[PDB]
């Protein structure tokens, strides 16, 4: 049993957070985004996980080895020297996955959902064909790749990577199980696996589909970060309601780290996650915001649907709304209103912004 995790791209994602820490490492409900997936892979029982990274990082290798014996499972990573698309990681890691004949998971870096892997491997063994794909019913399917399926067997009749015509409602959930025979199909030259090999495999009929149960969300967008965290808080409340804190001054689904310290008569609204080491003063109302680690917010401030970066000092009487992302080491002055401002790191702000624009 092996598993591949698809990292890279360096941009288009949650950029003010991605400038100081890589994308799979940024925290998401007090855990990194990669760490959720590899913990779920530990739950699945895979012996070995490889991750393809398009640029080498010191602190990522640091974090993954220091996590990697706490997990007790070795995890290796492969560096590509040109971005060979999303298919190139399969061909570069071919022999490492191909010395034994056992089907392997391929996971995107940004997908977070309920992880069905133990049921999905028995589905893969039962249907017996080459490639299995998780699919989910979504409301806006133009952004994602769209598959049509069968009634009972789940054979994928057609796969389109970008629809633009409404051929179906169900999308690629983003979780693949690939046989070793698919490794020899793809060449080392840069291709796209979601576009190229799944379409020819669909008209062959080796591709099969499986319906995910709940609360799938893509966390690539900086806007979709907040509603994905909002959905994950509700699903974790349904599964483990003890882990969410309950208090007289906090309402809704609140997930507080043990290292976080909160003042009194401050009203934390629904779907708020506080990182480790944050300090909230008295009289801060926070609704639908995530707060990353080491960040201190001053008193009497209102924050709706905001992302606060690490070691981020926020002034007194500060209002922030409309997916405003704060970055690495931002010092917002007192009595400022930020509507829609994503902030470049290591920058202090002196002017309240009426309209949403990137503050460099």
């Amino acid at each position: 049993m092996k598993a591949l995790i698809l990292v890279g791209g360096y941009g288009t994602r949650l950029r003010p957070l991605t400038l100081s820490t890589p994308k799979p490492l940024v925290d998401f409900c007090n855990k990194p985004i990669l760490l959720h997936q590899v913990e779920a892979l530990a739950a699945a029982g895979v012996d070995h996980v490889i991750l393809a990274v398009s640029y080498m990082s010191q602190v990522l290798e640091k974090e993954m080895k220091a996590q990697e014996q706490r997990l007790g499972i070795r995890i290796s990573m492969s560096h590509e020297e040109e971005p060979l698309g999303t298919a190139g990681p399969l061909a570069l890691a071919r022999d490492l996955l191909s010395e034994t004949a056992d089907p392997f998971f391929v996971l995107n870096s940004d997908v977070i959902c309920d992880f069905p892997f133990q049921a999905m491997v028995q589905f893969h063994r039962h249907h017996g064909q080459e490639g299995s794909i998780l699919v989910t019913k979504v409301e806006e399917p133009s952004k994602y790749g769209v598959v049509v399926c069968e009634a009972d067997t789940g054979r994928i009749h057609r796969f389109v990577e970008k629809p633009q015509v409404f051929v179906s409602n169900k999308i690629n959930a983003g979780m693949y199980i690939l046989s070793p025979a698919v490794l020899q199909r793809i060449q080392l030259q840069p291709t796209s696996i979601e576009k190229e090999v799944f379409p020819i495999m669909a008209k062959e009929g080796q591709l099969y589909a499986m319906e995910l149960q709940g609360f799938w969300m893509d966390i690539g967008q900086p806007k979709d970060f907040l509603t994905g965290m909002c959905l994950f808080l509700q699903s974790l409340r349904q599964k483990q309601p003890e882990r969410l804190c309950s208090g007289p001054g906090i309402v809704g689904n609140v997930l507080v780290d043990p290292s976080a310290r909160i003042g009194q008569n401050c009203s934390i609204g629904p779907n708020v996650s506080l990182g480790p080491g944050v300090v909230v003063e008295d009289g801060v109302c926070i609704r639908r915001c995530t707060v990353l680690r080491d960040a201190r917010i001053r008193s009497h401030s209102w924050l709706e649907s905001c992302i606060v970066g690490w070691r981020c000092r926020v002034g007194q009487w500060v209002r922030m709304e409309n997916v405003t992302v704060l970055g690495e080491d931002v010092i917002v002055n007192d009595e400022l209103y930020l509507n829609g401002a994503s902030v470049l790191p290591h920058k202090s702000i002196g002017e309240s912004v009426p309209e949403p624009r990137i503050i460099m």
Binding site: E140, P163, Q164, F166
Partner: protein, 406 residues
Amino acid sequence: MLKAVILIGGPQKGTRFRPLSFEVPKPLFPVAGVPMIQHHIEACAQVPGMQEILLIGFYQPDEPLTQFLEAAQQEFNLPVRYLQEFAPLGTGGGLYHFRDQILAGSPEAFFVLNADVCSDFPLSAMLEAHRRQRHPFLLLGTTANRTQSLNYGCIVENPQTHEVLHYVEKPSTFISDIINCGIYLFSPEALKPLRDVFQRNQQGTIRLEQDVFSALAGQGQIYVHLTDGIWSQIKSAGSALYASRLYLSRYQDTHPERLAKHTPGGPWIRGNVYIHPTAKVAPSAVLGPNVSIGKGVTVGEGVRLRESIVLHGATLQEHTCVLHSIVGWGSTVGRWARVEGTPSDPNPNDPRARMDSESLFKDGKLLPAITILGCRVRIPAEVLILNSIVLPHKELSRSFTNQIIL
């Protein structure tokens, strides 16, 4: 024996949401290479026993229209005539006024086709259902979105007997999803109820949908034949471009010799592209999907054309990019010049989205849509035209953005 009546409009009744052409008639506008009513004429000539084709509309007979009639008569070996109303008599008034010319010869039934629709034209299927039941009115019907249905004429039917129980014309509220497609089949008895409507007007102009269809609905006189194929209405410029895309995709099943092949020695072609034989395209040019080129067009070295329509005699010089734009005839685009438009299109998440058309101004703001270049418009070198409507015989000198250039 059957003839077919095509209701081409008049000049005032077009009232274009974006003017696709300022100088040629709307029914002679080339959609996917051939004029707009030539699709109707060809699909009517394929039907067996088609004796004649009539065009009713109050255009004055300019020489382009009569020259098109010269060409079409000897192309399809059918007599194609033009009957001009003396005044704008409405949709069904021109049918009643010219009843002696249509009824002569005693046709078994006769088609009525709107000129502005772009459709599959399943005239044989409608003819088989009509030969089965011989009812006076047969209507083509299509399935539409709940929001988009308020623009067309909604039809409530009995699902078993396929008879209209209720008809309403552009309703303010949602009524039904089936919409009238502007294609009808008329038995010779069906000119009798029209006459009745005429007498009520004396106590001239008969609107066919509001006075005949919306009054006689439910009384066993109107039957709807549902259909499946492609359907759009050519109201605006963007809907003309989308209808041209629909016809270029339809061309694979009927005329594979019309679409340009890949041709690795010549110019690059991706997607469905119509190139005229007289047009000379340089081999370095690459023509993207859904592109029609007219007769006598000299597409230069290095041109990129995507989602465009180039009328006859236009010249594009080197390294120009033309995206989502209608280029009028005789127009010249200088080198490194870019003509761009915005494809409003249809929603990709909606199951049955029908691509609405909007009349040039959303709520007092000009909205971005297909760039129109008028006839004999000279775009100078290294200049950008974006989301603009350029009137004819105008030579620009600077870049224009989101403007109607008078």
